[PDB]
């Protein structure tokens, strides 16, 4: 409980700001993705809800917004992908450093 | 107060079955992502902490486990991605029907 957090806390501190920052950065990115998907889900059930109501040209604005949200999330996930690559190479670099030492 | 949650109820219930399940699968995958990230961080820091103290073998073992967790994670992110694409397909199909 509280002691496991101390150990968890402990663990994080022995990690160069290099890595820790990219992890929380990935954290934030994942949060962003979840949020984008939420607004998409809402756009979608409104599509199904109103639908014929508010005319059928409502699909234009709606579907455009759906595509926008979806693309946004995709870009955010591609960004987490980049960040994980970064963390990967930064592992490798700190590694090699220690090995020839 | 929780009107946000009754509204989300009515929200969800407007979706067809396919779409609902893909979204809930997605949420499951998010959780799994958060755990993979977590676990990976922990092996990384622990490996740094105990890097110099332990033997070459221990370094190689921790590194293999780290690599695991990494690819692990990476796979989950792809599945979440994949789910999002399925959802978008189902959506524009439910439009092409109308």
From Swiss-Prot, chain B:
Keyword Ubl conjugation carried by entry: yes
Whole sequence portion shown: 1 to 97 of 421
Species assigned in the record: Rattus norvegicus
Comment, domains: The PHD-type zinc finger mediates the binding to H3K4me3.
Subunit record text: Interacts with H3K4me3 and to a lesser extent with H3K4me2. Component of the NuA4 histone acetyltransferase complex which contains the catalytic subunit KAT5/TIP60 and the subunits EP400, TRRAP/PAF400, BRD8/SMAP, EPC1, DMAP1/DNMAP1, RUVBL1/TIP49, RUVBL2, ING3, actin, ACTL6A/BAF53A, MORF4L1/MRG15, MORF4L2/MRGX, MRGBP, YEATS4/GAS41, VPS72/YL1 and MEAF6. The NuA4 complex interacts with MYC. HTATTIP/TIP60, EPC1, and ING3 together constitute a minimal HAT complex termed Piccolo NuA4. Component of a SWR1-like complex.
Gene behind this protein: Ing3
GO annotation, cellular component aspect: NuA4 histone acetyltransferase complex; nucleosome; piccolo histone acetyltransferase complex; Swr1 complex
Molecular function terms from GO: histone H4K12 acetyltransferase activity; histone H4K16 acetyltransferase activity; histone H4K5 acetyltransferase activity; histone H4K8 acetyltransferase activity; methylated histone binding; zinc ion binding
Protein name: Inhibitor of growth protein 3
Keyword match Transmembrane helix: no
């Amino acid at each position: 409980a509280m002691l496991y957090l101390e150990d968890y806390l402990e663990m994080i501190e022995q990690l160069p700001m290099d890595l820790r920052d990219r992890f929380t950065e990935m954290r934030e990115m994942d949060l962003q993705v979840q949020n984008a998907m939420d607004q998409l889900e809402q756009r979608v059930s409104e599509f199904f809800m109103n639908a014929k109501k508010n005319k059928p040209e409502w699909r234009e604005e709606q579907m455009a917004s759906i595509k926008k949200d979806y693309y946004k999330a995709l870009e955010d996930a591609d960004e987490k992908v980049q960040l994980a690559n970064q963390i990967y190479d930064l592992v490798d670099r700190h590694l090699r450093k220690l090995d020839q030492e």
